[PDB]
Amino acid sequence: EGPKTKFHALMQEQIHNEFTAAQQYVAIAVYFDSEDLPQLAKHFYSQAVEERNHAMMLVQHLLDRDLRVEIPGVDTVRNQFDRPREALALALDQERTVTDQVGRLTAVARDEGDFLGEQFMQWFLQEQIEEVALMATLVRVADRAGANLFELENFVAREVDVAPAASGAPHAAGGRL
Amino acid sequence: EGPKTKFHALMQEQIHNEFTAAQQYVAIAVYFDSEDLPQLAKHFYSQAVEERNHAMMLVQHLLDRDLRVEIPGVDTVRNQFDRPREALALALDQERTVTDQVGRLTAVARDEGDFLGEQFMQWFLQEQIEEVALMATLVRVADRAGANLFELENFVAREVDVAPAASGAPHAAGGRL
Amino acid sequence: EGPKTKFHALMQEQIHNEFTAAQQYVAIAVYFDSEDLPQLAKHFYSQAVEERNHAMMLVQHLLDRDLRVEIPGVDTVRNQFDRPREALALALDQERTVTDQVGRLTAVARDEGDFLGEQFMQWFLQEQIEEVALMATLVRVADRAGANLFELENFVAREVDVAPAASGAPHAAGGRL
Amino acid sequence: EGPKTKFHALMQEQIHNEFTAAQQYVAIAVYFDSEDLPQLAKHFYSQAVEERNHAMMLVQHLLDRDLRVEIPGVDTVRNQFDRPREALALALDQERTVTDQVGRLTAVARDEGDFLGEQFMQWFLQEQIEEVALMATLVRVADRAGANLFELENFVAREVDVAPAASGAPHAAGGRL
Amino acid sequence: EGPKTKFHALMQEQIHNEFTAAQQYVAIAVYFDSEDLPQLAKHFYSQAVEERNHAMMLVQHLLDRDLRVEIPGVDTVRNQFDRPREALALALDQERTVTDQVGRLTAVARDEGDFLGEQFMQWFLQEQIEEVALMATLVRVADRAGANLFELENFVAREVDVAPAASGAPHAAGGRL
Amino acid sequence: EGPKTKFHALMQEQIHNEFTAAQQYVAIAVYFDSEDLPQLAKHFYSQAVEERNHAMMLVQHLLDRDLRVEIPGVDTVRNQFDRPREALALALDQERTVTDQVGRLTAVARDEGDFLGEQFMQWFLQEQIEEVALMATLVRVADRAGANLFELENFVAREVDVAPAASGAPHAAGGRL
């Protein structure tokens, strides 16, 4: 209790960050749900679930290496939004922050010579590319729609496709939801 | 912002309590997972998911009545346990506390004359009976097994059965996981 | 317009290189086609298509990161060959050059601290191993066949197998052909 | 090397033109892709592929007549557009230019008394009618939609139908993609 | 014969190490077989086969890069064990040593600027995480079982699951067994 | 430890010999693989696997009689060959040597009055007939082909048939691969 490597410490923080991110995505979906944007709400419920899966993957990685892992609390998240665009903006900012965090985790792994950690990080880097692309798309399409939220909903219904999970995902503690 | 009924306030607290309970169940499952009790860990991963569903149901109820609902933070939960029995004890104590909370919610609904709330509460009362029974079973079987954790795992594998959800559950925001 | 990172610049050059490589593969296939080596021609038509897919993947990567991407021209390629071996040699030299280019792209990604780029590059490294192996095989088998082109064609028909794409390929702009 | 008929020369130029046209269609699709007009982008990715097929057909025709054929470079194409309409306009202008080119090829065939060439040209004339009609439709529908790009996308999704290739197409070198 | 890179040399040593590891796993399985622990013996026969596959993958990698590869001898392995736990301990120590070896191979690849080698190593890093986790589980469960070997066998039968190979494995010389 | 019968001792040596033979077959297959003789390489990968099975059968026989059995090391094998014929010659010489070894094992069994051993040996005698016949065929066909290795490969592809294992094989420790 005390000889924790930087990578171990950073991974525990990332588990906190991921659970917090999942909760923020839930808050955003509920906000959309209560503005009668079901398509957006459905998409973000899915996102909350997948963020939860990511946290479980970090947990599972710590279990597999027999490193001490704790399930954290969750910070309060944001529920007030003036307009749907502001919540899509928050989600884009969150995805970009997650990209930075995973990059920092990779860098710390490489610095400590923790090869296992570095390899494990690679899949998250890959997921981040696609996630950020989709959130940026949603933000741009929201700007184009402006006041007309129905067009935004129609774009989401036609163009935003739930993909069944590719293989290659790391195993999540408790199985991937 | 301010004319919130007691039932509305209490339901928002219950949403906080349920999310916290789900997180505590996750912590317990991870603890079991890292003690190599896969059967117990699998059961409690399921329990965490179902507690999450319950919180979503409370959320959905507030959405359906157009009452203000906020997704809360989550308190830190307990991760240290000296022995598996102590974690099964924590889970039993939590289920009993939840029974009290749902009973208090029912009582507050009845007091305010909120019939909709009272009816909605009924399903949770029903779920509590079965949940508490199962946790109490697990605690008694852990005592009987004592030091021999393999028997506990074998009991769980043979006797503890995931049931597909009966009908009659209230709808959960974002669909039941 | 001007703050382009080295990785962005290098990726745009690689898009030019890949389209050029696809066109050179087409030229080689047409050359084989007109020497009545259908098996070789069929193989290299496939190769041209797969190089095109690779270019589309680089394009898609730039789209996903919202980086400016331009579809380039294509340099003139080589059409004259004295003998089929000389064209298989050109193809081997091209595959090796591509290996260098992808390695340089990886190195530039690592240097700029562009983790997303580095991860994305990994799949191309992997494809290069197999591609170079197969081209080197074709060159050695051409030497062994010498003047007797029928044996070369028979080797290709029996031993060179189109594999359906494994999973794990990055997504190509416009879908993988 | 030097006794090339006008039809042979013109066909080699047309192969250059077709490859250039395919690349321009790719540039247009990528432009649409990066403006979040997936339906338009999908349509033009298809168009790029079909232009490539056309070039391959011209190649195959030269192979079948044992006429010298070279795979050319590709001119740089246009990537900047101020607004989607301007790119649909470019595509319409390109289809009309292609109609002129194929007509000139037919006329040159008839002039040299190259019956084989003339017959072969007929299928391209036929394809041009339909292609120009569709591009002109897209331009008119873009004008009607004006600023509202969502309507344009909806028109494309409902009304623009990929048809499986009719029979009667000439064979393409390397098989029709 | 003499300009061998460090990565080439280290890979040849790793091929020796992997074949030796496979043979040691066979010795362990035979030891379990002759102590009437069929479930453990079955698991370790599988492990021996999969270690053999790993060696074949390293071989295939050297074949694909046209690097000189030799099939080595195999060192004598350990057959005497005082108690099954001591053999599970040997297997855990071996898996950890393999993790170090693959990490050293990765580091040497990165040092020489051998990108192909580094990418190829990644899959082995990933396999090591899971393998070490499972061996550590077996050791802990053996300690918990103590003198009672039947519980150990029962844990293995219920909880240790042969997974069909995921995709993404590198190709093994002679096909994966 | 010391009252080992001649048959027991000889069987342990044979286990060493068989593992060595399997490794030599692997070396030969890899040699063929790296000369681009896939059909020969495939055949000898199969042979290596079947030699491994034979060693496992000898192991299993010692397990069934509760005789002490040790998994041995493996001698270094030959990897250099000047020409494919020289490796087919090595394989023929090895199969003939194995025939002698199994005959000596039978003779020693008969001498010690070990009926169980003698009966068990019979299946190996039978396998040797067919194996030697096939290797001798390959050598003669290689001589007939001479410099023209393609004919050798074609003979192997058409005439050398993997047969599913007949019944009557003795059981192999860890199941027959």
Residue numbers in the entry:
A (entry chain W), B (entry chain D), C (entry chain H), D (entry chain G), E (entry chain M), F (entry chain A): 5 to 181
From the primary publication:
Ferritins are protein complexes that are involved in iron homeostasis and DNA repair by storing iron in cage-like structures. This protein complex is formed by 12 or 24 subunits with tetrahedral 23-symmetric or octahedral 432-symmetric arrangements, depending on the subfamily to which it belongs. Similar to as in S. coelicolor bacterioferritin, Fe2+ enters BfrB from the B-pore and is converted to Fe3+ at the ferroxidase centres.
A 2.12 Å resolution cryo-EM structure of BfrB is reported, showing the typical cage-like oligomer constituting of 24 monomers related by 432 symmetry. However, it also contains a unique C-terminal extension (164–181), which loops into the cage region of the shell and provides extra stability to the protein. Part of this region was ambiguous in previous crystal structures but could be built within the cryo-EM map. The C-terminal region 164–181 consists of a flexible part (Cflex, 164–173) and a rigid part (Crigid, 174–181), as described by Khare et al.. Our EM map displays well defined density for Crigid, residues 174–181, including a double conformation of residue His175. We placed water molecules here, as we lack experimental evidence for these water molecules being ions. Both the A and the B site have clear densities, where the A site is coordinated by Glu22 (2.55 Å), Glu55 (2.78 and 2.82 Å), His58 (2.51 Å) and neighbouring water molecules (2.44 and 2.65 Å).
